[PDB]
Symmetry: D2
Subunit: 425 residues, 4 copies
């Protein structure tokens, strides 16, 4: 229909140049796709209530950040319990349940040269309380990441390490840091004090570009909607900053004081949701996909080969979604790195992987709770149907839509190798 | 994993160039072709190429399609040519390494305002003798194709009609002719008399471009190696002409007097084979694939969606082949339209489809004759392994190679919707 | 490397490490982003003009002299507040501060004066107060009018009529502030000299989360049309009370420049804030960094592909001059202009080289601040008897001012743009000159 | 009507594939034929009357093959070429210069042979414009040819013929010291597998286009025309594809030296080249040549790119350039403008030699001098305009780009002007 091609900035998407793409952006072209950039909300006195946490989950919070610069271990254990209680209050409806990750943001090294003694204790607390992600403060070199990994011990091997780049040395040694990290946070607060404030946008754009090239998550952080700590509506510069972080290629956007201590935590999450959805439709996928493909090296990994084939197929048919089965999140991450317009619906039995895949743009995790079927092919089919039923309930899919289904040839992680074109019935 | 030697062969340095100009600058006479020759060779049968022993040498030299020119000879003469071609082809059924299907094409005498009485009788002879293709002479409009289609009686609807464009009217009404034809022949002999000789290259390049855009076979014909009718080696202009027809995008190249009446028919076939193999490696796939992708409309047909995903996947891993199961040849034709560097190995139970897919560049037909398995998934797996084992025997594949496999979700033509990445064991 | 190897040997590796030149040479936009370097210092003069709103914090002659030194190019008078007497005094103070630097013609910096109208309010068109304010503007010789709440082409015709026959030279910049203005943008731009993306009212008239789409669309269309576009409101808002801006504010300024804005604006930050000079300095610092980060390779290619073929010799000369400047990394393009039009046509192709515009018109010298990368030089000498000698003297004045200000050094290449006869509309010559 | 001619619908296409789809046999060429024709002189093309017909048919360069004939034979060929060329000098606005090229016998089983030293000396003494040096395998072979030409042969252009595997492999070092290259497909097709010659041709043409140096495609282009009045379909395709590849010149050997249809062979190359030049996809070609040409601080190079960009912006009918050595015209030619490059020169030798550069139309200036240098420059520009109008290149209302310098003498081109005709 003609109505379909007028929505989600599709006239601007078909433009032959980036300049013509800008000229065709339309304020009346409504977003249809689900919001793909994850929202990280910092927990604090304004967002610790179990009832308030339920509202923030409904507003779109995907990752709850625990800032270990404030409060004791007892305070953070209560924050974790409250987040889990609010998240699990929706588990009674499996088709709409939204996993929420818990990230531990370290206090940092301070005047020390590396991992502080308080950080070693906090990291151990994180492993004992089952946190999903660590946002490691003031990462300056690859050995800082190795120290965090060692402090997590053998029980914390599955925790994702997102290195925070906060100073000149971190920016200069970025490549070596990214190589050993799971992802990066552009920590603009400290970065804007360590380097001239007028240069922060260059460091942000460079780091986002390099993370997009590497296929690793990147988070944009600090003062994105700062005035909403006290005001019900943000400034024109703040809405612009959120939109531009998404357009730059950020996988996640963050709220700090806006959700930790402000008077509008739910509204700040709703505002980031609304802006991100508009900005995602305005992405010039024609150039972005071409450049990501051209820059990505040749691969003999079947998961990577299936992912690029699936993303190409999704663009060819305007697929509503790519449904992928994943144990660790890796198959969903490899689809996400090619920035499809189609939502990546990731079905997993791992509660931890379901929480962690929020780090990857456009990955919508679905936690499958049913025990395995005796026939493996039936178990695979039941999970694909669960993805379809959840997608229909949530508005991602309708009867008549085309979907790309990504699975593997045997049970266990690492064997994705099949892409299938399915019509929704 | 692959080695530096791998990346020096098949013009791979020129393939990785960022511009067409740099691609030309990187072409290397020492970079040897490795892929099997993908442009089919059509040889005209006549006194110099009619004997069974001569036809066996032409099949070994690379002849894929035998052309019967109905402008000369009786029905009895042509029936004997067909019998000799079939005897020569079937003499290799005892060795899978040497057996190759060979299509039989009937080239009509021509028109009068429309279909001549002789053409009606010759087309009826074609249906009765089971020819695979008709090269329809002097097609000037869509109704000329409809007349040929109607003359293929109740038994010949599966015969491919390749319209020969031989005059100004055929060039001017090209779009309406291509729409109703299975493919086109650029009949340069008559075209060069009907329009100024210096304009034939424009008509050739335009028709090849439009056929490539439509995904329909196009044949370049007449005087390609003309001097080889009396000389053992061709001129510099003749080798250039063959290479440029392949670079232009021709699916097939043809020999007329060179094989029908000349003194060196086998050498003419060998020369076209040698040039086509060099020219195919020199194709600038980076721009070709991007432009075919951009110009092809969005599609909701699962065969078309699977085909572009499979070709994208094959480029990502430098796949040795794309193995496709096809009953009519259509799934192989849709892969061929995206011009993959990987060979398209088409496994079919239809002897007719196996001969006809020689019209599509890079399609290597394998005729499967095993009785059908009771469990359909087992019959599919047996055909995929048949394509892998044939590929290993013929030199296309080795253990450790990656192949893309294209199949559908249920039996019957029209359901192709699956692409898998397999590692050869 | 082959395309820059000889010039790298000649100009040095240090030259090619500055002004984001490694990012400029990238083959893709993604690689361009990956190569942006916080250690790559800007060298070129700041090309995006700064509009500062005049008020109690920036009205004194001494304060205005510091703002001119900090980088203010256009002084905005907001007619929503203050009487005609108040605004006349602001104009006098701006002119006194500007003319305090006239003693040195080789370094004099012109400053434009813009009148921002109160608006229609609940009315359907031009209000009676706006008619009186526009007449005040003509009588006091303002250079630009920022017309509030422009909704259609007839609104700009009403502003033009209210300026009368004596205000024909004043530039009309239409402020787009509501849904109707965005929807009828093409008809408004066609009859306006330029556009202001008035984000304050726009963010109340349409959903706040859609303002960035309207901003990017309007900037893109103005860049395609070759007409000035201003980004306005809350760019450095927190600087009204704080000495340093937020991370979102610096990002907003940088992104407005990267989007393609010709001008950026300060409202409360300069009119009533505690750090007006620091706010101007911050916009100057961010704009210089962002201008160097522009991906000229794609921008120039797209401006050429989208611009229609032209038989206008000024337009043909402009693209040839910008192409020549990129080929040699020219320090500047020196252009002679009567109305500013030849400089505007060079500016539309977004050269990295500064466009040094030599003019005898004091008004054109102030108005060309609306065009990105145009550095006006007011030539005060009387005409030579031989016209060709007069042209040569003006080109030499541009070279001498360029050397004095640091734009040009001995050994640099400059592109010189002139015409074949006196009078506006005859630019048709491009020359490559080596600075001695 | 303007936008339907010279393959302009195909020129405006957004992709190369769409460009091919839009090529039209009814879209007539309008621009003058840009690719020069080299005709080999022999028994079929030696008489003054035959040479006059070949000049009218489009021959730009006369090739003397020193593999056959004595010095006396070649001196007579040169005299006949000059007599035929000068028979048209009475009309200066339409006079067409014709270059004379000496093609050496080669080294045989040997570097520079003793016969080649004598033949090269003969060339200098008889004022030849170009040397086609046979079997060039390395840079020292070019240096030997240059030394054999002596101090009097400094101005002669050396076009190195690449005829074997070593020449192809050491191409970069050969091109660096040569004025241009000839893809000598005859010997190349015997030295390397015949099926690989097209790769060597396309690579050498691409590298010469990148370097901004002339490249000639040679041998068997219209071979069947030695005995037949019309060429084969492969031969017309070969000529068209050499032009599309980027060849500056195309050549005729036996077709003009000994064949029965020498004039018809020249006419056929002219007709094909004109059609192929209009089919060039300038949108991609200019972008790639512009991107790949290095950044430069040479004012002639800077002015040249600015002038070609300006010509494309206004669909300029021509770029008129004043040149002493041909260099300013060569630097414009390297960007492959659609606009004809009309080169006004006083040097008769430079006028003959610029036929090596595609799209350069030499005009030999023989009008009385002006006392004021600026008036003399203006008069040469008006001469280019008047010759252009007479020859059909220009009409009243057209826009032209004019390229001049700031002072007399070679090396000072730095000005580009947009001029409206009449
Ligand atoms: O993304 P990951 O971690 O590699 O998981 C993908 C795996 O999921 C599957 O699709 C389903 O596997 P399970 O049945 O073990 O859940 C496998 O075939 C595939 O290897
Ligand atoms: O190319 P075609 O003619 O559409 O045939 C493709 C068909 O081949 C298959 O892969 C195998 O089907 P069959 O078992 O009937 O041969 C189907 O799943 C698919 O629809
Ligand atoms: O940019 P504008 O307004 O067209 O002015 C450009 C004009 O300036 C000149 O360079 C100099 O003209 P004047 O001598 O009148 O100042 C003209 O040749 C040219 O037409
Ligand atoms: O192309 P070349 O050999 O550099 O010649 C270009 C020269 O021709 C001119 O345009 C005219 O010079 P002359 O008057 O000496 O002929 C010079 O200004 C310029 O330097
Ligand atoms: O769509 S883009 O051409 O323009 C942008 C605009 C932005 O405002 C920000 C980012 C991009 C972008 C980022 C990429 O990595 C890329 O490969 C292409 C782009
Ligand atoms: O590889 S190409 O850019 O250059 C060619 C060169 C030829 O010599 C011939 C054809 C092509 C070509 C054809 C296409 O349809 C296309 O989409 C791209 C190309
Ligand atoms: O340099 S760009 O490709 O990427 C941008 C990135 C932005 O962040 C913003 C704008 C652009 C841009 C704007 C254009 O009009 C254009 O023609 C090209 C560009
Ligand atoms: O696609 S092109 O127009 O771009 C070029 C660009 C170069 O910079 C060089 C050559 C070409 C070219 C050459 C051909 O033979 C051809 O068939 C097509 C081309
Ligand atoms: O720690 C942080 O998030 C910062 O400095 O922005
Ligand atoms: O019939 C043919 O093949 C021709 O005319 O070229
Ligand atoms: O008036 C203004 O400038 C606004 O609303 O932004
Ligand atoms: O000498 C030549 O011209 C050849 O060998 O092609
Ligand atoms: K912290
Ligand atoms: K026939
Ligand atoms: K106002
Ligand atoms: K010779
Ligand atoms: Mg910090
Ligand atoms: Mg025929
Ligand atoms: Mg307003
Ligand atoms: Mg030879």
């Amino acid at each position: 229909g003609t109505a379909f091609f007028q929505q989600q900035q599709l006239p601007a998407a078909m433009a032959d140049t980036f300049l013509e793409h800008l000229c065709l952006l339309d304020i009346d072209s409504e977003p249809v796709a689900a919001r793909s950039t994850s929202i990280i909300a910092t927990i604090g006195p304004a967002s610790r209530s179990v009832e308030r946490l339920k509202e923030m989950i409904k507003a779109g919070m995907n990752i709850a950040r625990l800032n270990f610069s404030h409060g004791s271990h007892e305070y953070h254990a209560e924050s974790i319990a409250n987040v889990r209680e609010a998240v699990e209050s929706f588990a009674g409806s499996p088709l709409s349940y939204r996993p929420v990750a818990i990230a531990l943001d370290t206090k940092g090294p301070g005047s020390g040269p590396g991992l502080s003694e308080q950080d070693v204790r906090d990291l151990r607390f994180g492993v004992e309380h089952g946190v999903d992600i660590v946002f490691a403060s003031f990462v300056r070199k690859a050995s800082d990441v190795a120290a965090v990994r060692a402090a997590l011990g053998p029980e914390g091997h599955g925790i994702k390490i997102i290195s925070k780049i906060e100073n000149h040395e971190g920016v200069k040694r970025f490549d070596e840091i990214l190589e050993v990290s799971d992802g990066i946070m552009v920590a603009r607060g400290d970065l804007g004090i360590e380097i001239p404030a007028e240069k922060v946008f260059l460091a942000q754009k460079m780091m986002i570009g390099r993370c997009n090239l590497a296929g690793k998550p990147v988070v944009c952080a600090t003062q994105m909607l700062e005035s909403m700590i006290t005001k019900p509506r943000p400034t024109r510069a703040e809405t612009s900053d959120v939109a531009n972080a998404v357009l730059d290629g950020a996988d996640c956007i963050m709220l700090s004081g806006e959700t930790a201590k402000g008077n509008f935590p739910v509204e700040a999450v709703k505002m980031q949701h609304a802006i991100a959805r508009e900005a995602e439709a305005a992405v010039y996928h024609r150039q972005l996909f071409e450049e990501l493909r051209r820059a990505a090296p040749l691969s003999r990994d079947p998961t990577e080969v299936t992912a690029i084939g699936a993303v190409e197929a999704a663009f060819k048919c305007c697929a509503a979604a790519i449904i992928v089965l994943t144990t660790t999140g890796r198959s969903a991450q490899l689809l996400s790195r090619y920035r499809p317009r189609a939502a990546v619906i990731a079905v997993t039995r791992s509660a931890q992987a379901a929480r962690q895949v929020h780090l990857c743009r456009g990955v919508f995790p679905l936690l499958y709770r049913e025990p395995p079927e005796a026939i493996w092919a039936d178990d695979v089919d039941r999970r694909v149907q669960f993805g379809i039923e959840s997608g229909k309930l949530r508005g991602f899919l309708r009867v008549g839509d085309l979907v790309i289904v990504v699975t593997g040839w045997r049970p266990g992680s690492g064997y994705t190798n099949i892409m299938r074109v399915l019509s929704i019935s």
